[model samples]
Target: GSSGSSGPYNKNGFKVGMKLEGVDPEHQSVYCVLTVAEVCGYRIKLHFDGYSDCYDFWVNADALDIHPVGWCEKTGHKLHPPKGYKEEEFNWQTYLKTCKAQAAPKSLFENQNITVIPSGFSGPSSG
Candidate 1:
């Protein structure tokens, strides 16, 4: 959706975060480019530059021209979760555990008798 024109319109004829320009049906000639936040059925939630946080407008998706805002030169702005990640779902504990586990190198050199002390393995205690 953020990829703008690169992506197709959804069933509501709207896509998330796409930039659009239109005159308010109630107030003509006052055109504005709206950022689509979310779409529901035939209605879309819009956020504009001047009214980003508080003000919002609901409009029909098909009524607006969806196009690239051209803020960044990079093309095809697709939204994706980070590597091996899912949206709204992250486990720092699991990630740390995995990192620690993977970081501790397993040595086949152990069987060769040239092994350095294995991690977490203490040497013989001096009584």
Candidate 2:
């Protein structure tokens, strides 16, 4: 049966460009934006926004490590800066100004049941 217990593992609900929080595979504890790149049944491919595809990954639909946008803010956890983000070179003021305009849709998280299951896979190597 497709009960709520399996609800989180179903990937049909994800969409490309939907923004969510994910762990930095290399850094493990760091959190960053994970944008849905592709969805195949219970497996969803994701990539770190503002960074290269080298950091892309795949995870099951109900993976607990993924979180809705603003999860960090609500949990008081500091979001990790994007790869290649140099503090001195970054324009904080300009970034803040442009961020709101570029923010992902809030509806993506509304009424969604989220859990914290630890499952993720890094991208594949070259052929």
CA RMSD of each candidate after superposition: 22.7, 13.1
lDDT of 2 by residue, 74-127 (tens): 767877656677534544345546654233444544545667656785566674
Cα misplacement distance, residue 33 of candidate 2 (Å):
1.4
> Which tens-of-lDDT digit does each residue in 18-94 have in candidate 1?
44444444565444445566778667787763454466777654442333232111233322223355534533235
Q: What value does the lDDT take at residue 115 in candidate 2? A: 77
Per-candidate local distance difference test: 0.46, 0.65
Query: Model 1: number of clashes?
Result: 0
Pairs with steric clashes in candidate 2:
8-62, 64-116, 64-117
What is the C-alpha RMSD, rounded to one decimal, of candidate 1?
A: 22.7
Which numbered prediction scores highest in lDDT against the true structure? 2
Q: Compute each candidate's TM-score over C-alphas.
A: 0.38, 0.57
Collision count for each candidate, in order: 0, 3
Candidate 2, run of 10 with poorest lDDT: 100-109
